[PDB]
């Protein structure tokens, strides 16, 4: 399967509740690392990283991110001045990462934002930085003189992928897991809409459909958003709003498809509180 390694850095100037610098690292969008400028320490966030790296690894990661904090402090000071903003809370963000597809092909990105808006983005084909605004153009020229694109491309295509491969092996069983959805049909009142609820599944892709009398039914359907659970699994629901009469006269069912397998629930499965 495809896998990814990503880092997201958040820098804040003038805040109290949050630290000056926060870094989170993720494999397949699941956090495995945390750092902030209050603790000044990079720490493990999964069992698979804990079992496979130790003090030497974390001391090195801590050192890199102390450096990142210092650079983020300096950077946000510069950009604020360029927008003529000497007061108030401002933010500086960096996200970067790499993906390894099955064919062994790789992708990668490197991006920065000021106050949550694009500032500079790496084009690693042309080895240039796309500046989103005039304020970013000074940075574009500086970084192109310092060969920053080249360094970043080197990291993304080599170092990042080398480590991603290690992490995938460390966490193989967790990262390659296929957990089927637990599916229920919910109804608050016999005359109310019926909700098909799917939870506890991984990976996140799921298809929820409704059928009337064995045929796909797309009218009066409200498909909910994909939502995260607390434990790294996911949930999603769809709601059918036909009347109790339409339900009485026909054979409606929900079909949940995940990993080429289907679960079906019918009126006989409907659960409710109060009852």
């Amino acid at each position: 399967g495809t896998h990814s390694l990503k880092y997201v850095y958040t820098g804040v100037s003038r805040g109290i509740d949050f630290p000056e610098f926060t870094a989170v690292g993720m494999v397949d969008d699941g956090q495995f690392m945390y750092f902030d400028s209050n603790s000044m320490k990079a720490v493990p966030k999964t069992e698979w990283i804990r079992q496979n790296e130790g003090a030497d690894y974390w001391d090195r990661q801590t050192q890199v991110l102390i450096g990142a904090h210092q650079v983020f402090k300096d950077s946000i000071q510069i950009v604020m001045e360029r927008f003529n903003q000497s007061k108030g809370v401002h933010t500086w963000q960096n996200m970067y990462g790499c993906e390894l597809n099955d064919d062994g092909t790789t992708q990668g990105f490197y991006q920065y934002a000021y106050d949550g808006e694009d500032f500079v983005s790496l084009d690693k084909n042309t080895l240039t930085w796309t500046a989103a605004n005039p304020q970013a153009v000074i940075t574009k020229h500086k970084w192109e003189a310092l060969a920053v694109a080249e360094q970043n491309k080197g990291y993304l295509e080599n170092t990042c992928i080398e480590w991603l491969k290690k992490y995938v092996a460390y966490g193989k069983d967790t990262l390659e897991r296929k957990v089927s959805p637990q599916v229920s049909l919910l109804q608050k009142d016999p005359s109310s809409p019926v909700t098909c609820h799917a939870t506890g599944f991984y990976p996140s892709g799921v298809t929820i459909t409704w059928q009337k009398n064995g045929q796909d039914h797309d009218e009066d359907v409200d498909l909910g958003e994909l939502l995260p659970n607390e434990d790294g699994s996911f949930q999603r629901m769809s709601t059918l709003n036909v009347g109790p009469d339409e339900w009485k006269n026909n054979r409606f069912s929900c079909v949940v498809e995940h990993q080429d397998k289907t679960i079906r629930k019918t009126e006989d499965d409907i659960i409710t509180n109060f009852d």
Binding site: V64, V71, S75, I78, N152
Partner: peptide
Amino acid sequence: FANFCLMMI
């Protein structure tokens, strides 16, 4: 592993 090399803007 995070990128070791950062440059200020």
